[PDB]
Amino acid sequence: QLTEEQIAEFKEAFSLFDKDGDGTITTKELGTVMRSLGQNPTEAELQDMINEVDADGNGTIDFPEFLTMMARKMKDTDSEEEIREAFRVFDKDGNGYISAAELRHVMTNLGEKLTDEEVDEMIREADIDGDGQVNYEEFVQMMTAK
């Protein structure tokens, strides 16, 4: 079940999308965050994304709606679709490898400014085969490793 800490973590995600902190995520706000992740959804695509979480159909996502969806996806521990989605967030050029620059770009837009050493450390730890980049197999491990 949801713990106080878990709700706080989910709130950290919610806050990233709810830019003006008015308690609801709008089409406009989602567009902004999506673009910051390297995506470029149309108005229709954004509305569809909101629709999947907007249980009462008022056109926006509130915290309870967000929590319900996030909690549901977390209980499905065997799911890999969200990991694949995260990989696509990083892999901007679609070459199947996350470069140090690609890792840094996402972290920067998530509000985490990292030094070159920090970025290289993150890559090194996940880079099992040592080729300097993180492939999908390595990514699954860095996203699920305890």
Binding site: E9, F10, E12, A13, L16, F17, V33, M34, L37, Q39, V53, F66, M69, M70, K73, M74, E82, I83, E85, A86, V89, V106, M107, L110, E112, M122, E125, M142, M143, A145
Partner: peptide, 18 residues
Amino acid sequence: KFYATFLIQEYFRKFKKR
């Protein structure tokens, strides 16, 4: 990308840990 974002933030929390 709501959950994917959380997974990345979760990863960062882990990185900061040990």
